[PDB]
Structure 1
């Protein structure tokens, strides 16, 4: 409903003890699947298939991570463990402080994301697409660590 302002911060622990940082910028939108709140955290990508309730025991992640999830072309998983919605819930349940789907491959997620506005999650859910989506994955793909900063103006 409102535009989400994503700042992707790259940092380096300088030897002086201090930290230097390189901010990148993007925009996406808040899904009504989730709260209209700002958030921030160490970015973690998740494979969409990593987000199944199916697994009895999974990997642990430190609490507070900003998930990042590249959705796939609809026709490449015939039936998922869960719906996009469902998966955000997993994320949040697994300690996600927010979730950011790169929606480029599949828009319908959007209509499926905003479909559960009745029972919204504690925490923001956001999508991105297009060049804004590409930049995200360029950082997520080539860098070691990056902190995400989502603001609700």
Structure 2
């Protein structure tokens, strides 16, 4: 159930070319989703961005990997969707995978694994710890980055 995540970050050269930079992180496949690998360009999502008006413009170019840092649970107490619901909505919107940074809402792990009986066909990964920090520092400062999620 360990999720080996590779992030390919593109760093602007002074000539305005870009330089590939690869970083390694580790998370866990949630029992809520497939035990499969996935790869695609990272799109950061705010978690309250995964409540549905069901608009066409919400469908990102098929195959993106969504990165969602969960807020402290006493901040969005009337949440549109469960964390599990948010993962599904991400997949409906074209996500090949979702990574949850569960650092500020570690109870979210349990909330996901309760959906274990009807799992998503796509992987749902959670990160925390330094591994979440590394990913978020890439994502916050990274205009374009690509994630490769490898199972085993």
Same fold by TM (over 0.5)? yes
Shift of 1:14: 8.9
| 1:39-75 deviation per Cα after TM superposition (whole angstroms, max 9, x unaligned) | 1000001010100124556533100000000001000
Whole-angstrom CA distance in 2 between matches of 1:109 and 1:74: 9
Given the superposition, is the C-alpha separation of residues 142 and 14 from structure 1 closer, same or farther in structure 2, using an over 3 Å criterion? closer
Whole-angstrom CA distance in 2 between matches of 1:85 and 1:47: 15
Structure 1 unmatched runs, 5+ = none
Shift of 1:26: 0.4
Shift of 1:11: 3.3
Shift of 1:13: 9.3
TM-score (normalised: structure 1): 0.91
Structure 2 unmatched runs, 5+ = none
Given the superposition, is the C-alpha separation of residues 15 and 75 from structure 1 closer, same or farther in structure 2, using an over 3 Å criterion? closer
TM-score (normalised: structure 2): 0.92
Given the superposition, is the C-alpha separation of residues 53 and 36 from structure 1 closer, same or farther in structure 2, using an over 3 Å criterion? same
SS of 2:103's equivalent in the other structure is coil
- RMSD value over aligned CA atoms? 2.3
